[PDB]
């Protein structure tokens with residue numbers, strides 16, 4: 001049964017609620033983004049209207065085979081009417097196709113659902129600037145002050161400089177990047193651009209990337225592993241055993257691997273600067289964990305909420321324990337007292 005924080009009051013709508021069967025009273029199912037914890041339950045047998053971004057709707061049709069007649073893609077930054085209710089989709093700064101949803105209820109209440117997001121000051125100049133928001137359904141993934149990480153731009157600068165140095169020292173080194181979902185494509189695309197290479201990958205991952213409307217993508221990715229010196233592998237294979245095995249498969253073209261695991265936060269964030277990050281190494285294999293996040297840091301989250309000044313906050317992440325819920329509520333009250341709303 002569907003939890004209350006997935007239901008939009010005063011509407012027939014749910015958000016990211018496909019794993020509960022037929023939800024009583026739902027007339028339209030919204031999907032914020034194509035990550036499995038959010039789409040869990042969708043398939044070719046789904047017969048209710050799904051509302052989403054264009055990119056999300058490409059992934060539903062090609063990867064999950066949802067029939068076309070039930071996919072309702074909406075343009076971003078555009079007022080649309082859905083079952084008698086005005087809505088707007090906004091870029092969430094998460095993975096490709098990810099959106100936040102603004103609902104303008106018939107009684108005058110305005111609700112923002114962030115989906116998954118990485119808050120940014122650029123959001124302060126979207127269509128959010130123009131009216132008051134009463135209720136915020138918030139991605140609270142990293143809602144505690146210990147969660148610090150660098151900007152995405154600093155992390156990509158480190159990755160490109162690290163890869164370019166290694167491969168210039170040894171032209172026979174292969175670069176490998178881990179993946180298990182969409183998101184974080186800048187990691188492998190930026191590294192392949194500095195090296196003058198396409199990115200090589202499985203047919204299943206190439207298919208996924210071809211749904212994403214990335215400009216000039218045919219110029220950047222390939223299924224011909226032998227022509228590429230940046231390879232994508234499943235995240236589970238980014239360990240010394242899995243990388244040794246991969247190196248065997250390359251037929252003596254390469255004699256070294258430099259591998260990247262883009263994680264979110266890890267407790268090595270509480271001590272070390274990005275500049276000072278070092279790899280784990282075993283023989284001719286080196287593995288870097290890099291803190292590339294597609295969710296808000298604590299400070300980014302706090303800035304957004306203190307700008308928006310919502311009357312009520314509903315967390316959507318970390319809701320299963322009393323300790324987590326009490327911690328989050330204490331920070332919300334702090335933010336409100338500091339800012340004066």
Ligand code: NI
Nearest residue numbers: 033035094116
């Ligand atoms: Ni997500």
